[PDB]
Amino acid sequence: IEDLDLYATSRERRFRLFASIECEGQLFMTPYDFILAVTTDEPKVAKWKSLSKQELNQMLAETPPVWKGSSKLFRNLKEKGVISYTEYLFLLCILTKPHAGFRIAFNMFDTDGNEMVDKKEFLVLQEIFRKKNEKREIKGDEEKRAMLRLQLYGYLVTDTTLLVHFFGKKGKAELNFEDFYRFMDNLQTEVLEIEFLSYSNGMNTISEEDFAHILLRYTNVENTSVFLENVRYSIPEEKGITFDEFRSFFQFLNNLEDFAIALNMYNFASRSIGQDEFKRAVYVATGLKFSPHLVNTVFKIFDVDKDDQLSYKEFIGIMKDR
Amino acid sequence: ATSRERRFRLFASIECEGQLFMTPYDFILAVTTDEPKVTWKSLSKQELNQMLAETPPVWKGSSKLFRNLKEKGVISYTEYLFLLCILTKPHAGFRIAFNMFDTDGNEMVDKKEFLVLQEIFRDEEKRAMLRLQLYGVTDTTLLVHFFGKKGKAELNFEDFYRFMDNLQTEVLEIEFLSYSNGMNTISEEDFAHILLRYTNVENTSVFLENVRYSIPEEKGITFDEFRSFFQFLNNLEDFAIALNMYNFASRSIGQDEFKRAVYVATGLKFSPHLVNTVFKIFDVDKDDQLSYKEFIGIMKDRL
Numbered sequence: 001i002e003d004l005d006l007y008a009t010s011r012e013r014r015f016r017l018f019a020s021i022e023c024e025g026q027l028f029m030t031p032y033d034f035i036l037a038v039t040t041d042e043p044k045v046a047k048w049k050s051l052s053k054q055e056l057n058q059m060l061a062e063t064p065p066v067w068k069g070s071s072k073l074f075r076n077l078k079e080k081g082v083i084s085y086t087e088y089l090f091l092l093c094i095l096t097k098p099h100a101g102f103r104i105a106f107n108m109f110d111t112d113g114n115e116m117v118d119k120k121e122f123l124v125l126q127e128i129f130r131k132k133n134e135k136r137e138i139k140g141d142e143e144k145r146a147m148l149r150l151q152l153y154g155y156l157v158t159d160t161t162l163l164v165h166f167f168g169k170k171g172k173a174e175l176n177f178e179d180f181y182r183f184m185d186n187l188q189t190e191v192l193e194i195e196f197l198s199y200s201n202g203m204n205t206i207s208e209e210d211f212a213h214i215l216l217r218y219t220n221v222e223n224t225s226v227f228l229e230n231v232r233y234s235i236p237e238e239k240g241i242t243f244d245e246f247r248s249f250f251q252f253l254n255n256l257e258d259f260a261i262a263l264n265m266y267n268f269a270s271r272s273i274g275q276d277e278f279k280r281a282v283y284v285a286t287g288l289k290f291s292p293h294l295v296n297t298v299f300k301i302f303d304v305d306k307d308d309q310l311s312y313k314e315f316i317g318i319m320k321d322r
Numbered sequence: 323a324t325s326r327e328r329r330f331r332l333f334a335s336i337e338c339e340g341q342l343f344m345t346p347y348d349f350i351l352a353v354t355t356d357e358p359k360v361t362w363k364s365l366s367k368q369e370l371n372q373m374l375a376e377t378p379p380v381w382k383g384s385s386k387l388f389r390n391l392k393e394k395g396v397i398s399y400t401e402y403l404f405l406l407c408i409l410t411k412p413h414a415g416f417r418i419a420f421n422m423f424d425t426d427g428n429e430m431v432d433k434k435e436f437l438v439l440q441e442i443f444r445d446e447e448k449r450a451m452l453r454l455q456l457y458g459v460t461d462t463t464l465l466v467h468f469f470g471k472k473g474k475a476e477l478n479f480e481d482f483y484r485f486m487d488n489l490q491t492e493v494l495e496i497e498f499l500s501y502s503n504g505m506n507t508i509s510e511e512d513f514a515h516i517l518l519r520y521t522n523v524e525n526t527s528v529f530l531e532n533v534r535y536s537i538p539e540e541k542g543i544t545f546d547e548f549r550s551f552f553q554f555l556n557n558l559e560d561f562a563i564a565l566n567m568y569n570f571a572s573r574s575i576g577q578d579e580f581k582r583a584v585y586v587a588t589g590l591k592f593s594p595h596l597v598n599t600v601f602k603i604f605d606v607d608k609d610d611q612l613s614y615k616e617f618i619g620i621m622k623d624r625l
């Protein structure tokens with residue numbers, strides 16, 4: 001409850017805010033609750049359904065096998081599934097990875113090198129985070145800390161939607177790199193689709209005012225309203241952003257590092273890039289092809305100086321790394 | 323002037339046509355030291371062009387190019403910037419830099435590709451005079467070394483890659499040797515101090531005093547260990563990707579996790595001595611674990 005927030009991290013408070021399933025004191029998110037957790041700010045309604053272990057396992061008995069993955073996995077599993085806190089963290093982490101990172105992640109999992117991931121490999125990290133936070137060095141409020149620990153990790157282990165989806169109902173299936181990649185690619189694409197569609201209202205395009213508005217979640221914009229007032233007046237016509245362009249730009253945001261390397265020669269010289277070699281830098285660094293409309297829109301959103309060029313802290317410096 | 327331009331002018335030693343240059347030794351100093359110790363020298367275009375006519379071809383490149391060329395070389399302000407940038411790129415970036423030059427995609431770099439991307443980076447009397455000073459077409463050591471003496475050779479990726487690798491290695495060797503005093507290893511304290519130029523460490527003295535008591539017995543860091551670690555620092559963002567969930571969970575890695583994370587992230591294999599040393603330098607909690615705000619948080623973004 002409100003009691004246990006005072007003992008909790010930001011991420012733990014937010015997990016608890018969006019979670020709706022309790023089973024033997026462990027709290028859970030449904031796939032819909034996760035979609036809301038990543039596309040929304042706060043829930044709209046307050047409450048909180050409590051399951052026994054076998055009504056939960058009937059809820060899971062459906063779960064599609066891994067080969068049924070699609071950007072619509074989580075929306076077809078609307079509320080018929082369960083996600084733990086660790087699993088939540090996993091999914092959040094996926095949302096920020098570049099595609100090459102999927103391989104870094106897979107290799108971080110495959111402790112033994114056979115190029116598959118056991119259920120038991122996959123479970124070691126929930127084991128690691130469970131143990132770590134427990135603090136036998138910090139005294140006081142042990143019972144409330146234990147309750148929050150239970151809420152977040154339980155106490156082989158309660159089956160979950162990702163656990164059954166990945167390793168089957170018996171837990172003996174294994175995951176190769178290709179399925180892992182497809183799960184993370186399909187989840188990135190799902191979250192992007194839900195945001196885009198949340199603004200398109202049935203069109204091919206979202207407005208650039210809505211584009212920029214979504215962008216401000218990724219920025220350290222000191223005054224949010226002054227920046228939106230800058231896009232509304234800098235761009236008197238709206239031509240609209242297509243889904244391909246919106247996906248292009250967020251794939252690029254996950255490859256921002258490689259972009260900084262590419263423009264490093266510019267930043268050593270304190271010089272600003274133009275839109276042509278901004279586009280070309282995006283291509284050679286990321287492999288993505290930005291439309292001239294997308295590039296032009298980014299420039300009108302971020303080029304405050306109004307030179308039709310972008311300096312280091314007009315774009316790259318302003319993006320947050322979380 | 324920008325910081326970088328003030329430093330270029332302070333370490334520069336050659337004038338030709340009002341145009342200023344660094345010699346390769348002046349670059350070594352500009353990269354390894356804090357300020358010069360003392361003489362200047364003015365060349366004509368053709369004594370500069372013979373001084374350059376000495377320059378070794380690409381296929382004689384080595385970790386010792388810049389020190390064998392001790393003061394028989396020429397480096398402009400732009401080329402200075404280029405080399406700085408070289409020093410900070412990870413090896414995976416080299417292909418991206420090369421492709422940033424190869425406007426036409428033939429997988430080679432003309433002299434004129436190289437010069438077009440430089441040349442884009444270019445009181446009325448004083449601003450103009452300083453503009454002459456940094457930019458002046460005038461041939462340089464890098465132009466002759468890369469594209470031959472009449473510049474119609476072109477540069478394939480193989481030689482580009484080895485040039486920036488060997489320049490990284492040259493600079494690292496000079497710093498290492500500046501501390502080894504003829505031994506096979508540098509001290510773990512001298513290691514820490516060198517690292518400290520890369521950190522946002524508020525109090526350096528207590529930090530060094532902490533490695534000195536954390537490592538009361540001295541084993542040394544070898545050059546392979548030292549180069550590996552500075553290679554890792556240029557690949558830190560792959561490292562952060564690897565540890566991303568530790569950072570999401572507010573959790574600390576142990577040395578085994580840390581070592582294997584370095585491998586999976588970068589491909590580099592740290593000796594257990596190297597890992598133990600990094601831990602003893604940075605694990606300040608003394609939990610034998612590293613939290614985000616002990617290591618990754620502490621590093622500067624190549625400022």
Ligand SMILES: [Ca+2]
Pocket residue numbers: 110111112113114115116117118121
């Ligand atoms: Ca395995």
Ligand SMILES: [Ca+2]
Pocket residue numbers: 272303304305306307308309310311314
């Ligand atoms: Ca601008």
Ligand SMILES: [Ca+2]
Pocket residue numbers: 100414
């Ligand atoms: Ca990469």
Ligand SMILES: [Ca+2]
Pocket residue numbers: 424425426427428429430431432435
């Ligand atoms: Ca070419």
Ligand SMILES: [Ca+2]
Pocket residue numbers: 574605606607608609610611612613616
């Ligand atoms: Ca620590």
